[PDB]
Amino acid sequence: GPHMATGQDRVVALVDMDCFFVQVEQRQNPHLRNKPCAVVQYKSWKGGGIIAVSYEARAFGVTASMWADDAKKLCPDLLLAQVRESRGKANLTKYREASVEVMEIMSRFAVIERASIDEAYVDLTSAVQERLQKLQGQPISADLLPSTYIEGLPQGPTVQKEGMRKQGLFQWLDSLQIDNLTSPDLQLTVGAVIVEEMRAAIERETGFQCSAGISHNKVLAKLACGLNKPNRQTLVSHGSVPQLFSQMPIRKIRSLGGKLGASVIEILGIEYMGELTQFTESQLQSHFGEKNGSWLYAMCRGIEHDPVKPRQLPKTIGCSKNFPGKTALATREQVQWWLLQLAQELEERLTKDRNDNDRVATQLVVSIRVQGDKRLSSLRRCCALTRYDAHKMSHDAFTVIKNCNTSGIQTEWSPPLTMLFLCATKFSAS
DNA sequence: ATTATGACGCT
DNA sequence: AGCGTCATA
Ligand SMILES: [Ca+2]
Ligand SMILES: [Mg+2]
Ligand SMILES: [Mg+2]
Numbered sequence: 001g002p003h004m005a006t007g008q009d010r011v012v013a014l015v016d017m018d019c020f021f022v023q024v025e026q027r028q029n030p031h032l033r034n035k036p037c038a039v040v041q042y043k044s045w046k047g048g049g050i051i052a053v054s055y056e057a058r059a060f061g062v063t064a065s066m067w068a069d070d071a072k073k074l075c076p077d078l079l080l081a082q083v084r085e086s087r088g089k090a091n092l093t094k095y096r097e098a099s100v101e102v103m104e105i106m107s108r109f110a111v112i113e114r115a116s117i118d119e120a121y122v123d124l125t126s127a128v129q130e131r132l133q134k135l136q137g138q139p140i141s142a143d144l145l146p147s148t149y150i151e152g153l154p155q156g157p158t159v160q161k162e163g164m165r166k167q168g169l170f171q172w173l174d175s176l177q178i179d180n181l182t183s184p185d186l187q188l189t190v191g192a193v194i195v196e197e198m199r200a201a202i203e204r205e206t207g208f209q210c211s212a213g214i215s216h217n218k219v220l221a222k223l224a225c226g227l228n229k230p231n232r233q234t235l236v237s238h239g240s241v242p243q244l245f246s247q248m249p250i251r252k253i254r255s256l257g258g259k260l261g262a263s264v265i266e267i268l269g270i271e272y273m274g275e276l277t278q279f280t281e282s283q284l285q286s287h288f289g290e291k292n293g294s295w296l297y298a299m300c301r302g303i304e305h306d307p308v309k310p311r312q313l314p315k316t317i318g319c320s321k322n323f324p325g326k327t328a329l330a331t332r333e334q335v336q337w338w339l340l341q342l343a344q345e346l347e348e349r350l351t352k353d354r355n356d357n358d359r360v361a362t363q364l365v366v367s368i369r370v371q372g373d374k375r376l377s378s379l380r381r382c383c384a385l386t387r388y389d390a391h392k393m394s395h396d397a398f399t400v401i402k403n404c405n406t407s408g409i410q411t412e413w414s415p416p417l418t419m420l421f422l423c424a425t426k427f428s429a430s
Numbered sequence: 431a432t433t434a435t436g437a438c439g440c441t
Numbered sequence: 442a443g444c445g446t447c448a449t450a
Contacts (some may be wrong), residue, residue: 049432051450116449324431
């Protein structure tokens with residue numbers, strides 16, 4: 001009863017940009033705005049691979065992980081913007097720089113955790129307390145939440161979408177007790193007010209729209225964010241969790257979309273997150289391990305304790321290229337030329353990083369794939385990174401992988417390399 | 431022949 | 442350390 005933790009101690013938001021690389025290209029090129037359009041990398045093989053898709057184009061069935069030639073079959077008028085190519089490879093700098101624009105704006109409101117190139121978690125607990133003291137028991141107007149959905153509402157005793165949103169918001173606000181500064185539901189609501197403000201600032205100052213989730217932890221905030229995309233935000237209360245989870249496939253929860261989640265389904269013979277509540281913590285620990293078991297036991301009740309890490313910058317800076325099929329690297333000179341291309345991009349990004357962020361990488365990771373191997377990576381070796389010099393780094397990379405060459409002739413490389421990867425890691429302040 | 435990333439867990 | 446898992450555009 002009185003001692004049961006309910007995981008309602010924090011207010012956490014997740015802000016995720018809508019169709020992000022497409023918006024970056026639409027800002028740059030007004031001809032692409034309000035169009036079915038997608039961002040593609042490379043072109044020769046099946047028109048290139050789509051990696052981002054506008055919502056207009058999604059209506060035709062266009063997705064990421066789709067070849068452009070196939071997308072054009074679904075949507076003949078699809079517009080395409082190409083990822084930049086530099087030194088023979090795709091170069092994502094424009095999107096990384098647009099990411100920094102958004103992350104720096106979010107950072108004005110609170111400490112953020114960069115979770116990907118286009119999303120960040122926000123711990124709003126302290127900001128919410130401060131907004132609550134200024135409000136002085138004053139009710140929260142629906143006008144302060146113009147793009148907010150309350151998950152699970154309306155319920156109980158119109159046929160248009162915005163109408164339903166307002167109905168749900170009205171029921172939520174009608175029920176609130178603004179008299180209590182420690183009320184979790186009130187805290188979430190104030191969190192949502194702040195996230196409206198954050199999202200408005202992002203759009204005003206960058207031109208980019210985003211969605212967001214507001215809840216009591218990262219997993220629920222992430223889940224909430226996706227419930228109403230694009231250009232909307234969703235509040236998932238603690239109380240909404242039993243109904244939400246009662247029909248929620250396990251794979252939808254972050255970290256359960258792979259083998260672990262499949263094993264939860266198979267071993268326990270269940271389908272939905274809510275069904276996990278019927279197992280003891282020890283039962284779940286027995287199947288999935290101590291850490292996963294405890295995490296699942298709490299998570300299926302809406303409780304999760306992973307902190308929002310104060311980290312706005314990536315911890316690693318990497319450069320990767322595949323050499324598929326016929327294009328696999330089969331000569332020493334090929335291998336060395338591409339290691340140099342990768343190293344030159346890496347040096348460029350590292351030198352910029354040192355100037356911007358007052359740090360230096362100290363370790364170079366070199367990874368390759370070899371033709372035939374099912375695995376992403378066949379081999380990963382580290383060596384010292386002591387100077388930001390591309391020729392040194394590429395020479396060093398060649399040295400750590402040189403003996404992977406089964407070839408009796410040193411000029412040839414066998415089995416041919418289908419991937420090269422250079423990654424700078426282990427930063428120190430500088 | 432999605433590709434190019436990037437974080438965190440295991441032993 | 443090197444490998445694996447899961448996740449992003
Ligand atoms: Ca996004
Ligand atoms: Mg995202
Ligand atoms: Mg996406």
